[PDB]
Protein backbone atom coordinates (compact mmCIF):
# COMPACT_ATOMS: atom_id res chain seq x y z
CA UNK A 1 0.00 0.00 0.00
CA UNK A 2 0.99 3.62 -0.59
CA UNK A 3 -0.02 7.10 0.57
CA UNK A 4 -3.53 8.12 -0.41
CA UNK A 5 -3.67 8.78 -4.15
CA UNK A 6 -6.16 9.59 -6.91
CA UNK A 7 -6.96 8.52 -10.46
CA UNK A 8 -7.41 11.35 -12.95
CA UNK A 9 -9.46 10.76 -16.08
CA UNK A 10 -11.82 13.12 -17.90
CA UNK A 11 -11.44 12.25 -21.58
CA UNK A 12 -11.21 8.81 -23.23
CA UNK A 13 -7.95 9.91 -24.84
CA UNK A 14 -5.19 11.19 -22.55
CA UNK A 15 -1.61 11.43 -23.80
CA UNK A 16 1.05 10.16 -21.39
CA UNK A 17 4.03 11.49 -23.34
CA UNK A 18 3.41 15.05 -22.12
CA UNK A 19 -0.01 15.09 -20.50
CA UNK A 20 -2.73 16.32 -22.85
CA UNK A 21 -6.40 15.43 -23.27
CA UNK A 22 -8.15 15.04 -26.62
CA UNK A 23 -11.77 14.47 -27.65
CA UNK A 24 -11.11 11.91 -30.39
CA UNK A 25 -8.28 9.44 -31.03
CA UNK A 26 -7.47 10.82 -34.49
CA UNK A 27 -6.18 13.86 -32.60
CA UNK A 28 -4.37 11.88 -29.91
CA UNK A 29 -2.58 9.89 -32.61
CA UNK A 30 -1.55 12.80 -34.83
CA UNK A 31 -0.19 14.28 -31.59
CA UNK A 32 1.54 11.35 -29.90
CA UNK A 33 3.46 10.47 -33.07
CA UNK A 34 4.69 14.07 -33.15
CA UNK A 35 6.56 13.59 -29.87
CA UNK A 36 8.78 11.04 -31.61
CA UNK A 37 11.21 12.39 -34.19
CA UNK A 38 14.60 14.07 -33.88
CA UNK A 39 15.79 12.27 -30.75
CA UNK A 40 17.59 9.08 -29.66
CA UNK A 41 15.14 6.33 -28.71
CA UNK A 42 15.44 2.76 -27.44
CA UNK A 43 13.90 -0.67 -28.12
CA UNK A 44 10.22 -0.23 -28.98
CA UNK A 45 7.84 -2.90 -27.70
CA UNK A 46 4.12 -3.24 -28.32
ZN1 LIG B 1 1.71 14.30 -25.59
Curated annotation (Swiss-Prot):
Zinc finger (C2H2-type): 13-35
Subcellular location: Nucleus
Sequence similarity: Belongs to the krueppel C2H2-type zinc-finger protein family.
Function: May be involved in transcriptional regulation. May have a role in embryonic development.
The name this protein goes by in its record: Zinc finger protein 28 homolog
Amino acid sequence: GSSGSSGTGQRPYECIECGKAFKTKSSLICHRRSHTGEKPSGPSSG
